[PDB]
Amino acid sequence: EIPELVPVGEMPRNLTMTCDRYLTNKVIPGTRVTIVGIYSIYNSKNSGVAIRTPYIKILGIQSDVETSSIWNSVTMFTEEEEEEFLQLSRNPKLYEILTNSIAPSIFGNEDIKKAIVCLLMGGSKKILPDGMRLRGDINVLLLGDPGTAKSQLLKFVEKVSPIAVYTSGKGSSAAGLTASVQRDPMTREFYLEGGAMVLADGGVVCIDEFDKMRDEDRVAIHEAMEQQTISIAKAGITTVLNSRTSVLAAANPIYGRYDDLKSPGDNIDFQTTILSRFDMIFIVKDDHNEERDISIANHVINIHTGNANAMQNQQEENGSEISIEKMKRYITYCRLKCAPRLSPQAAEKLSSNFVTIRKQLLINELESTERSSIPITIRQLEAIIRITESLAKLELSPIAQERHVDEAIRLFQASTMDAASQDPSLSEIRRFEQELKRRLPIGWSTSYQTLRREFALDKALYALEKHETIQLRHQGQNIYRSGV
Amino acid sequence: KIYPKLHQMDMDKVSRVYADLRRESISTGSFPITVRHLESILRIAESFAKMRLSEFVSSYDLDRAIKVVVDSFVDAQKVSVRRQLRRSFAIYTLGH
Amino acid sequence: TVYPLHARSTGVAARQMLTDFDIRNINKLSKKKDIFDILSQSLAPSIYGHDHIKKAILLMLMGGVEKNLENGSHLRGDINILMVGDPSTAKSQLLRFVLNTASLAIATTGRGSSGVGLTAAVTTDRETGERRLEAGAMVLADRGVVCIDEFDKMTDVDRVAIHEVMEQQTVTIAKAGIHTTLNARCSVIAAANPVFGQYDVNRDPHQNIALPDSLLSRFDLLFVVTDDINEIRDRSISEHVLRTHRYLPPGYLEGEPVRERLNLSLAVGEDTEIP
Amino acid sequence: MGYYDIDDVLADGTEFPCKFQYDIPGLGYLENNPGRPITKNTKLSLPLWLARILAIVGVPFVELLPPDMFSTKVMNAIKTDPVALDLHSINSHFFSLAIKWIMLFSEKELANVVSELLLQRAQELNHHASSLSIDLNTNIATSTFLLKLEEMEKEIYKKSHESYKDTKRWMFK
Amino acid sequence: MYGDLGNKLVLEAKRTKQLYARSNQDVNLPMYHEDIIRNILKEVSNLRKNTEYLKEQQQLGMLDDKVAKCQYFVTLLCMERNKRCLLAYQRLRTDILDSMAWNNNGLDLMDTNNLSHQEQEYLKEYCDLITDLKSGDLVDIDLSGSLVPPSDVFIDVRVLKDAGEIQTEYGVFNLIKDSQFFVRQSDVERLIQQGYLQKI
Amino acid sequence: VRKDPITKEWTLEGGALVLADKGVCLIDEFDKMNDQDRTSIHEAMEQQSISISKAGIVTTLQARCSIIAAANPNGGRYNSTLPLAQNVSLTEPILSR
Amino acid sequence: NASQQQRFSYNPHKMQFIFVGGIAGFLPDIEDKVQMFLTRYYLTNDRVMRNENFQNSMSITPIKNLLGRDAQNFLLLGLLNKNFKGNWSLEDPSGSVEIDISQTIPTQGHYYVPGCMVLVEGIYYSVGNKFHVTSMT
Amino acid sequence: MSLPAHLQQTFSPEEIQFIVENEPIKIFPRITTRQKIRNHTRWQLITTDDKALNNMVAMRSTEVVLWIALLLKQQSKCSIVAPQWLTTKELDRKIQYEKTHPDRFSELPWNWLVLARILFNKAKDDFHDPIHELRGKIQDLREIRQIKVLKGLKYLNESHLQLDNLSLLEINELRPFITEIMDKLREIHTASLTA
């Protein structure tokens, strides 16, 4: 029964029914359907007197996520809706429309919404002749302060995605996420029952409270979120199933707040291995910006006092926002229609950007004299390639252009570099601060080359700019004592 | 049997109160003031309208909720800055 | 009729038929001086570098002789290699390739494996209705290769079983009124991660691995993979990976999903050189 | 077989297996050896448009070998179950290449087989084309069969189905 | 081998063919692929240089008729194939441009950036040629008129885009937006083609 | 979840928050239980839902609970001179709800 | 006049498009300050790829693509300038590269200043991440 | 191009309707254009003869071109007379004849489907028979003829074909498929017969 229709404090009630002929294999578990049938009765010989087992004989199914598989892994798309999808694909502002159509009740978070769009689209799966394959899913983690609608974002993603499973961090076991070996009560034989993430095959799993993964349960997903396969060797059963799922995880940095005063590795208990599989890692922070606070408060007040149900409907009718169902069908059509591949110029740009990013990580680790908790590796380049493919796919472009490369680089810098750019000798910094305070006059300025000749990375100048005692104005060629 | 509505209200005062709450929380404060806390004001106002069997949240139901929220926040702060915080917040609990 | 298609090629058996032309070409290529290097590099072209790892893999796939000495003495001829390295260093992809290439390769995950399901399971028959044993992951891989990913994540209680396997190539069962000794003369390849998120070169290679040194001893080779951030090497890796990712299948168009049907069974059954 | 037929142009550029008859010098521009010549009795795949001329002018330089698409295995498969054959997987332009191969070789038996295959599949594609879905307010079989068609069958199907849809639309307007 | 550029070009051409084939969306031509044109032109120029090289080297050197004939013949066939691919692509673009010109002569004269200068001049002169044909001898009939039979003479229409007031043949039409006329289909065909009246 | 003693399969039974759905849940000594037990109520007190993904049973219950908790200040006495976070052992997300 | 000219913005792929409101309607926008040198770069790049390649045919390598290459020969079309560090470099949409101005032979029939875009050629070094330039024009 | 692709070698149903619109049919004029012995403008057309139109007499059956009759039927100023094949008895006899001979088509007028559709749409109240029965019998004839066509398709040779007594609309709707399949079968045979 529908969870929204259960009685208060009551577990959902199951009910058996039978399909027939052309109605067989019409739907799959986890799908929401409506049935018109006959409420029939049969007497099972398996504990009162004159009791009778009730059931339904089916005479009609009305689903919304198509037949078995994803419309049987082929297009069940009528000509009118297909042509509508093509027309939507030709919209130049389609990117902005999709971004605005992601969590309308959630104010701001534009980059997060764009990353969600990329995830829902996903890259193009590659299968090489030599045998090994290249996955086309995007793994995104959302860290940050509590109360930033991350759980709301995961719930919306689960709502909008054609295939989506929403799970809680604490209420999650490794045997319940991928596969459970269970003994058949009648035949006394063991068999495998698909786990939560398996039910999300070809879709997405939204794991809230990602920080509440049991360490023995979190590791069990390492193989399947990367190899897209699950290997089970239990109770005489040795199988390797496929799980081509997207992963959207919501976690919390230690201490509740991020606590940027501590080291970035201290705030994140997740090891480098699990962080390596994840493609995008957003870190949201509560700016406590009073004007931003006012804007969010106004948006939330409009949300509560019935104004949301009017403005969202009006804006959706305006055409800059679109309903959940139409986005679901459009995403399905785009994923089943296009598998874009990169252009050689895009490949050169991506290689250059990857080398730049690795050099940046190397210099950051050298300055910190410590391995960065954020790993940047070849898998990150694969993530960028997949995001470029998703950007080309949502436009139904058969080949990815450098516009997609630029946007993917921007999103990567906005999320993964933002995570990797977080910072917690001091004697040199203090000496430089004091010498420039005593030398550089309070109301005057001097060129940066003067400081270079006087004499490193010279993060002291950036720290003082944070303190608003110095300011770089002439394109970094002139440092002026701002008045402090 | 009561489902009060927040049609009669002034979003300006609530927005300013939430902004000031966040401003004083980030600056010399440890109480987390998030959007959930802003929703708490409307929830308490709804409860106030419920206990009067009112189907619409009156102005008193909003001012009482705002005063309760700001007092609970202030009492959660150290006494050293508690007097200054109360002095700042006194302009919002007018009438009671 | 039963036709044993195997080797994951969808149409050929594991014991692939060898034509006289193929045998002659094999003999001719055996006279090549660096045929070893050619075969090693030809193993995983899509995997950049890791040449010595490929050499070790080729040695594993076709290993040395097993000495069935007298007085019960037995010297195993299989080669077992444990390769531990940084994340996203193609550690799992190498094992996937070996699985796709080896004649008898069985995949295993340290988290997704139980010792009973790894060696032998005491089930009950249904046709007769009485107790029976069912082969695990290594018994089925007898004379084959077992690719174990997330090796450090394996349960310790069931890790002694694989230790006994790689020690003496035989498992023993003494439960449920069944006292047997099964033979699993497999070759073991394992992929492992450091104790920390990354390898610490400042520490000896004992605390960097969460496995007993006795367990490490039975492995013929232990390969350390370090994801050191270079610039020229990183550029070469990026270019190679992009060349790989821009590959297009012959019977496929650009911007077209790679659908699979595998209905290539159009008929059922049997129906010098320097490259 | 018109000059500007796009399908014909695409079908011309298809590689076919063929051995050599002479140790011709200086060839191999992109055949793995630009300056190095091409040896005698060398089996290589060449585009059909070029292999056609190379198979006639000479003993001809090139001896064409029977392609996999016309092997006895595919012939038996066609003779067994023409309807359930995924001809698109075999090739996107199978019928045009069959026509060209028969025209070059005058191989009557292949023509006899392909004509029967074409007739049997034409029956089913006409069955599908004249079937028009009606909304009570894209059948599974229709789509799962459409994927097993070459471009010409997909073109005849489009034209016939368009004619049927126009007739139905005009009739019930 | 050598026809890969032409193969990609003709693949894109057939892609555009299916693109315009679906319904009657009247989309503009995809941007002129001057990149592939220049690449295959450079290939043809290099092959022509190779032909001249082989000819002069055979004249100065001692090359038998076998190799000199064979390599030259193969390269000539290569130019034949590449030229045929280019011809097919250009012919497709020309015919689709003809479709746009014929349908839109009474509709609109338009993003031209997708076309090369030769194609733009071709369209500009082809409109002139079509007008010359319409005004030459068959001027009594409208050669650009609708190809659907005139089943009905009097129809009702609704104004989509307000155009103020437009003088018809005899009276005048006040194209007030959201207003419905019921007039002859004969004298409103051009307005409906432009997109001002919608109802049938 | 638990294996049924009579029919031998996993079945899910609701906890304290399920029986308090659309009601009230009271937590005495909120500072004194295990933190790993205390973190199991985040979805329950914010999303008002319980998601279980264990033993092949995957579902999302609804718990519209009104959580009321009672705790004890660090050392048994509340030091008013200190910030509230220093007088408690709990974190921001548990304090935020 | 300067305010009566045709706004000719060159589409980076291949086009020179045309662009053509109040008292403060003539004030240039921030994006215009961004692209005032983007357009100059693009026009000079068009001039280079139309003239030099047809007259002289080793091409222009983007600065961003000079990272992993160790000591190869490169020709760059880049805006000569002095960095905030006070050393000479070339700016480009792909990136910027510091140049070893020593051991360089320019064309003597030109004036060279900071702010003019030049065609340098030389060998890149990843060890110092500097382009040792030998010829420039 | 000058001719759109979908009009290349077949007729659109609108073209078939227009062609059939020129067939002469007998109608009852509701006006009387016979200028008495004791002004007015004659039709004086050039695609047909104006003599009957200028000499129409109220409630006196004449024969005029079909589309003029439809134009008059836009008003109540005329009335259409159904042809003799549009009676229930004749339709039943044709049904029995079709069911009796499975290999040959009925001898209906070539324009029966389009005529039935036009008369049902625009002259729905000029039939002595219940229109709800005429529609059903017309649909039944269409289904039976379709069934016969499908069985006659299983003998698509490569030389020729004889579709005897078949109607016009069915031929028009089957032209693009049959004329294209037949071309491929002929081409295969000719390529085989290249000796």
Ligand SMILES: Nc1ncnc2c1ncn2[C@@H]1O[C@H](COP(=O)(O)OP(=O)(O)OP(O)(O)=S)[C@@H](O)[C@H]1O
């Ligand atoms: N930018 C925002 N726009 C709208 N609502 C927001 C925004 N940020 C936070 N909220 C609200 O704040 C609440 C956040 O609750 P959740 O999403 O369940 O918790 P969370 O933000 O995911 O952080 P956790 O789960 O405690 S680590 C919801 O009521 C959101 O609607």
Ligand SMILES: Nc1ncnc2c1ncn2[C@@H]1O[C@H](COP(=O)(O)OP(=O)(O)O)[C@@H](O)[C@H]1O
């Ligand atoms: N040397 C390499 N050459 C090519 N690809 C590599 C290399 N090293 C790592 N990769 C890429 O990294 C990705 C993840 O590798 P994975 O098997 O997960 O390594 P690990 O098991 O160490 O995490 C693969 O898709 C692979 O393409």
Ligand SMILES: [Mg+2]
């Ligand atoms: Mg949350």
Ligand SMILES: [Mg+2]
């Ligand atoms: Mg791996």
